[PDB]
Amino acid sequence: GAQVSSQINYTTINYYRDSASNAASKQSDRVMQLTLGNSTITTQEAANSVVAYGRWPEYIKDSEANPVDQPTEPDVAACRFYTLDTVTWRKESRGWWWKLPDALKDMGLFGQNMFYHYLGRAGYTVHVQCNASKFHQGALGVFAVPEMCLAGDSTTHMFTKYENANPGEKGGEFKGSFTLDTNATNPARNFCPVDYLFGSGVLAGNAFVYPHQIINLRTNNCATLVLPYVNSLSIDSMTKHNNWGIAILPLAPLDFATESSTEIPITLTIAPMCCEFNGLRNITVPRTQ
Amino acid sequence: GAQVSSQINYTTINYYRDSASNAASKQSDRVMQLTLGNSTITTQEAANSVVAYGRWPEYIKDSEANPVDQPTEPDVAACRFYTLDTVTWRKESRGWWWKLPDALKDMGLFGQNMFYHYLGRAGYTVHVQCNASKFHQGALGVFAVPEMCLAGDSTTHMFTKYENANPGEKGGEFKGSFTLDTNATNPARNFCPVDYLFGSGVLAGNAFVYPHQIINLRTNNCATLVLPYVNSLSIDSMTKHNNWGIAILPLAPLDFATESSTEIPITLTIAPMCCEFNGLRNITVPRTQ
Amino acid sequence: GAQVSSQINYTTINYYRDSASNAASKQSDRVMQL
Amino acid sequence: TLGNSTITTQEAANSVVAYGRWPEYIKDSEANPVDQPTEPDVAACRFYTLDTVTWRKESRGWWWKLPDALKDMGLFGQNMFYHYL
Amino acid sequence: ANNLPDTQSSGPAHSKETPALTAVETGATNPLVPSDTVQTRHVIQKRTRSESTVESFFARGACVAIIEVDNDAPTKRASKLFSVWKITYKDTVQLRRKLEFFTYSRFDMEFTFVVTSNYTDANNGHALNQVYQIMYIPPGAPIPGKWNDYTWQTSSNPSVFYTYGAPPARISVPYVGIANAYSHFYDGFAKVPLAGQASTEGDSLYGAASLNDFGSLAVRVVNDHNPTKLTSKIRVYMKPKHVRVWCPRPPRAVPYYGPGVDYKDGLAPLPEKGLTTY
Amino acid sequence: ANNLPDTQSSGPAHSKETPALTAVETGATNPLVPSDTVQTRHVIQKRTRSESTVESFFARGACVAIIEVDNDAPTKRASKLFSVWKITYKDTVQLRRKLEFFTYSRFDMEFTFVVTSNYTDANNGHALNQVYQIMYIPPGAPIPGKWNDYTWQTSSNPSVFYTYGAPPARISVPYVGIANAYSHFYDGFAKVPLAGQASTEGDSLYGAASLNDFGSLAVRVVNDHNPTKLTSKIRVYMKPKHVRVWCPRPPRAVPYYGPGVDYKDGLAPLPEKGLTTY
Amino acid sequence: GLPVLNTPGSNQYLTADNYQSPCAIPEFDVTPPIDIPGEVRNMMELAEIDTMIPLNLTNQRKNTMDMYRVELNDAAHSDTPILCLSLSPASDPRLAHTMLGEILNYYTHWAGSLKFTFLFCGSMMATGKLLVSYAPPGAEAPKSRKEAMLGTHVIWDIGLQSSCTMVVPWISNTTYRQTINDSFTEGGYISMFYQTRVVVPLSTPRKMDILGFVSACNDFSVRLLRDTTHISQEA
Amino acid sequence: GLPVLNTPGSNQYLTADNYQSPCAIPEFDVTPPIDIPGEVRNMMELAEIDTMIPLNLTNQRKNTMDMYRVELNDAAHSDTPILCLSLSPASDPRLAHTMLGEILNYYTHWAGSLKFTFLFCGSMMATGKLLVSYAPPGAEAPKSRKEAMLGTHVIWDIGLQSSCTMVVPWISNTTYRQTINDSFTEGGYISMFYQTRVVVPLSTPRKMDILGFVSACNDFSVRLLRDTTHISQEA
Amino acid sequence: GLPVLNTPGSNQYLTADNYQSPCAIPEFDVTPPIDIPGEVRNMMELAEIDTMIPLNLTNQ
Ligand SMILES: O=C(O)c1ccc(NS(=O)(=O)c2ccc(N3C(=O)c4ccccc4C3=O)cc2)cc1
Ligand SMILES: O=C(O)c1ccc(NS(=O)(=O)c2ccc(N3C(=O)c4ccccc4C3=O)cc2)cc1
Ligand SMILES: CCCCCCCCCCCCC/C=C/[C@H](O)[C@H](N)CO
Ligand SMILES: CCCCCCCCCCCCC/C=C/[C@H](O)[C@H](N)CO
């Protein structure tokens, strides 16, 4: 009935059936080995691993299962480390980005299961590898961004086409400045993610609110982010929706005591985890080019 | 006094004497024999029987008896199977309809009791009989429609005359299209029940919400509907008011491997049940023609 | 004080001193000598 | 019923379990390879319908091989070709 | 408003039970669940049908009438100083269709009156706030013949006096039917014509029970007229409450044509769509 | 809204524990307190974070729309006798930015409607008090085509009739998302284009989920027109209630440009400041 | 009197409000109810009743009884679909005007498994096997049996039991789908194919009809009442 | 009815009010929540996360990634400051647009200790000692290490642990400071100096970068919610 | 004061309403009733009394 609450008290009574009608109630860490399926990663210069939001990937609990068909759980056939194409960190590099599960769409049986099913769910283990010498310097910020929406390149809002929004393993690169696409006849309809705006109109310095690690070449040569499935749904369409983005930004430029421009590679190795698929039918073949 | 109810609760108090003032509170089956009176029906190709709304016909309980005079219950003299005139199902047939008790008004002592009394009540056992060969095909939907109001044939609303609304055992037929009666001098004042509109402006496909059976010639040759008395009153005037309508629609057309147009008969056999009559006086003689 | 009455009940309270202020409460025989 | 596929029949002649042995997974007492196996379950253990053939008066018969006949059947085929065993 | 059954895990099936096959000829609907035909996981179902109860389905005020009245000099024969609206839900369509999903119904009824007014010209001064009288005239009570005749004394009729600018007026009535339920459909007549009666006798409209089943509302502006004409509309909103309904029916598919089930136009509701077109 | 830890007295330190030194490479924030690096006294802390709870942060009505309607003769084609506003918090910026501090949210929502009106000219008489209808049109319900078409019967849509001069109208809705939370950001498409489909097929806006996710509000003046034109604005104020939020994000730093994350102008927010200038 | 403070929303009229109001006819002697057969307590009860699907909405069949009949024949086997429709029970024209679709068109959101039943109305001497398939969305719509058999499906043997039911299980990313045509909450594709073929002996009709019915399963629910587009009025 | 008396404030609309209102969608079947990772319950949780400081807002560096980098080199020792800023976390341009500053700009008052972390991004072969100082206000701002070392300070040794944290303790006359530039609640001065110098061997970059981060300590709180100046809209 | 919200029907006058109103003559010394014969408590009591039927309504 009547609720008496401390403020000397005050009385609150709900006069309506629906709760929405209620008033607001104001009351060493360097050495690691990771094994998934038939794949293993060793590192001697890690900086510990970051479990995003302190939540390990997990399968859908019965209390949260939306679809009713028996799901597929390929386990080791898909929950394994796939190594993406290596990119080159140079002095002039502004950064790189990938989307998940997009980046893994062509990765063996994970990709097959992804495209054969209406619904897919997976966490990830992202392992960024970047080794240099004790005489190199530079720092990479590695950020795992839930719902990493990126800004387009045109005056038309939300106009980036599916093909450019889902580049696959190659990913994309941040730019140093915003260039407006003025070709009205054949618009690029591509992202224009500016680095200091973190590609979405927010200062890059604040991107550390996201789960992240820093590869500081004097300290570590790898970063490991363990990402749970993050979404507003227990399970979603992997082809329509990228749950995670990976952003790599050079926080401190690459440098090495030589006149010639040094370049070192960055390699991404990503393992889906707790993969779960529902809604089997004929294979989805997305439009490309 | 004050009602505390879960939504974290809410309090409801009725401030008015009358309940209307209160706020809304949101809280084998193929073989059968039927015997009634001196009449018996056998069937070897039934599809079970449908008791409309799962309610067997019953006499008026004392707790629901409106008229105070001692009722008449002829029992076997009236609660017996009467066989209506047989109709012919052809390829072109659009369907047939009857009204109850209207269809039985000339059926022996049931009709006599019906016309000698102001008030009458009865459930029914409707038995549709339609046999063909294993080389015939076709399907009849048999629907028992409470308050089966049918659309008229004129611009004047509700203009169908009593004589045409109560055709008797011959019943009427659904039409394939709506034809407006334009004869203003001598209007037909007849129904124009279109088949796909179920004769009342509702899609025939939805008529299955009503108690129904299907005579699928490959499966069964009869349908049995047991209809309780359905009305907004315990008892009503049988001459003024038809409690039930029977509609028979060819869901799948009659077909048979011959160039000549095949025709098979449909026979309705209807037994009043739990007949109860009140208000005896001189016999009602309805106007005809 | 508060009167709870059946209509599923309803509550009636009189707010005035005077009763008039109250709402309406809906609750042989042929032969004789004299 | 297997996976998302169902077969009904009204004119069967019972079913024959070959040699009276129902299919089963490899027991630990008989497992030769040591790597953790993949068991796609419903993604692969489901009814696939092959191309229909025509029985005529002159037909002499037909043959298929398993697993060969199913090699292009969705995720069963994918798993078949992605694995040594 | 009950919760829904959980989905149970179901594995492969190989048996003589065939839930997929049935016989719709019996008139029954095959009560299959997904686990009867496919492999299913365990799902703890949390959805409920709270908003599809009949009460929730009808728990909305629907506009059933727009009664227009005037405040003007009685010598102006064009103006209408009072209006009588026979009570019914069949002057509009939406609530009618919702109700006619069913054959019978019992409900209390909440009437809410939304009154709007406006000037008709600008060269005859202004007006003081109007008061409107809405008198229920049950069948048999005298109908007002003039905006100021004796009937407006309303000694026994219930009347609501509504002051313009106040929140919409509102009253409630219980189930007032003379039968045990309201009949949305009546397959019959008020009269049975008798043999020998002239053609002008025993004739009644098909499907009508009473010529006046629920009476009328008579609406007037109580104020004497200002030098300028004012027009007002009283919109009547019905809300069924404590609803019970019997014998569901297929909903109206073609436009209503009168208070009966008759149809004249729009007899082609379905659009064109290929048989093999998704 | 919890209280804060007291500061503990801390004296001189001479040891091998070095809380000052850390490694931000790990991705963690060094959880140091003043006593870790300086000598501190004992302080009984009395400050609390009651006003920075997410509920307190969002416990404000914010204007999300200004819906303009007219009361005028329907022959005046310039006047707009009804207006449809698609429901969203992205027509203004302030509430949008506050919400977009986070990636997901669940909340009930309180809508408050502040209605103002005025004359447009002075040579056509005066007006009686107006009543406004605000009808919620959930996705799929028919949108009004005219200010007085059948849709305004609102038999099933919720409508609020607001009398001018009354305190702002107010209603509440629960969390109505079809997902388990509202998504402030959606990195995906409504459609996946399929190989072989023409360029005009399978194309959808980046980041849009539904073409119509929460429906619209249709607003009209119920009154018939006075001889003079009246203009009204209905300001819609949203207040999230019972807020829960997930996955914090850096706040918008450059001006919003459309409903997406796109940016075009004002890409130089930071001002100039010397490195060694206090 | 008692100090009070009027809050926002005072004097408004919300058509969905649930308040008490004075009775205009006090002390009325209400007629008691009787036990009428067929009482309904939830609109979903109506959606759970099978109603015939106007599957064949061609130019010459729509708005006639023929729209309810899908013609099969005994031609040689083919993989081409017999019928195709989208799982949009409220907006697909073949489902919108069924009882299920009519009920859905009063609500904004729906969720749960659907139930499609097919009745074979050929002669008893006709035999055949059909395949009824549901492909959850996101891939190309099945245009031959080869693609359709990869999704959910039931192989229907036409025999003594002349009806077959395929349950379309609830498979959705969102916990509810919208009752409009919208790609984000698209439902998938329902198709029918010849498994073997229809075979008849001599002296038997070589063309017959099948009828389609749809209803809601017991896990089905709707929410967000709304006005339908299926009824309109004119001045 | 019950005698009532309307008080002042009746019929007003206070945008901060907390009243009940009627539900426009009664009996709605709300979708239950799921356990989404990363739930936030207090905005201070966000302020406690280290975010990079745009320390170098020169003409050529502002509004670029370069603004986040402060350049050190191996020149001879000097007492001149490396970087200087004011403890105005909401109004100092180098702090205003950090996550801490962004949160503060929604509030009028702030109190508590701040936490500045510096990350050395030179080569492993580079060594050096720096001094990071906080001078509570009221005296001349430290313009050389001699003055700065008299205030609160930490001497940072660049070694295997490449990051150093200096806690700016809460030292204020008032129990809260305003989130604007105001001398009465000024916060003091933060500066960095070379303690010894940066030393590198041959074949090593002689110029490197340090990155700055700021966050709030667990004793930090804010009050008096307000609209920020960091977002604006135009007609 | 106490937060209140005025509902529809406020300020109307329903002639069938049953509300309390202030007494215009407080503390009036009402004359007590006496036991008058022939008290009636229901109008049906009057309908149950036989009354003569004007059966013959001819012109004269
Ligand atoms: O504004 C809307 O709410 C409203 C607007 C349009 C609407 N539908 S309508 O088809 O335009 C329509 C328009 C008027 C009437 N109508 C009358 O003309 C009338 C006269 C007298 C009594 C009753 C009524 C009555 O219902 C009925 C329907 C309903 C309500
Ligand atoms: O007075 C203030 O409170 C108010 C004043 C200015 C303001 N910001 S604005 O940038 O001037 C602005 C001005 C108008 C609109 N706006 C429209 O023009 C409109 C049309 C139709 C629907 C919704 C809207 C809507 O938001 C949006 C923003 C917001 C509110
Ligand atoms: C101001 C007081 C007015 C009170 C008016 C009371 C009348 C109540 C009418 C309720 C309407 C019931 C709906 C109609 C039912 C069916 O159509 C009839 N049984 C057949 O005409
Ligand atoms: C008069 C009654 C009107 C009732 C209106 C109910 C609609 C409620 C809308 C709440 C707004 C939620 C905020 C939007 C969430 C995200 O943007 C969407 N998930 C993505 O579009």
Author numbering:
A (entry chain B), B (entry chain B): 2 to 8, 25 to 44, 79 to 340
C (entry chain B): 2 to 8, 25 to 44, 79 to 85
D (entry chain B): 86 to 170
E (entry chain A), F (entry chain A): 24 to 301
G (entry chain C), H (entry chain C): 1 to 235
I (entry chain C): 1 to 60
Question: What does the original paper state about this entry?
Answer:
The Enterovirus (EV) genus of the Picornaviridae family contains notable viral pathogens that cause various animal and human diseases and are regarded as potential zoonotic threats. These small non-enveloped RNA viruses contain 60 copies each of the viral proteins VP1-4 arranged to form an icosahedral protein capsid. The N-termini of VP1-3, as well as the whole of VP4 (N-terminal to VP2 in the VP0 precursor), form a network on the inner surface. Glutathione (GSH), an important cellular reducing agent, is a crucial co-factor for the morphogenesis of enteroviruses, including PV.
Since GSH was shown to effectively stabilise wt PV2 VLPs they were soaked with a molar excess of the benzene sulphonamide derivative CP17 (VLP:CP17 molar ratio of 1:2500), applied to grids and vitrified for single-particle cryo-EM. After image processing, a final set of 51,518 particles yielded a 1.97 Å icosahedral reconstruction for the wt PV2-CP17 complex (FSC 0.143). The bulk of CP17 forms hydrophobic interactions with the network of residues forming the VP1–VP3 interprotomer pocket of the wt PV2 VLP. The wt PV2-CP17 structure is similar to that of the CVB3-CP17 complex (RMSD in Cα atoms of 1.1 Å), but there are differences in the precise orientation of CP17 as bound to wt PV2 VLP and CVB3 virus, although the key charge interactions with the carboxylate group of CP17 are maintained in both cases. The interaction of the C-terminal residue VP3-Phe236 in CVB3 is absent in the wt PV2-CP17 structure as the C-terminus of VP3 is disordered in the latter, the final observed residue in wt PV2 being VP3 Ala235. In total 520 Å2 of solvent-accessible surface area for CP17 is buried in the interprotomer surface pocket of the wt PV2 VLP, representing ~87% of the total solvent-accessible surface area of the molecule.
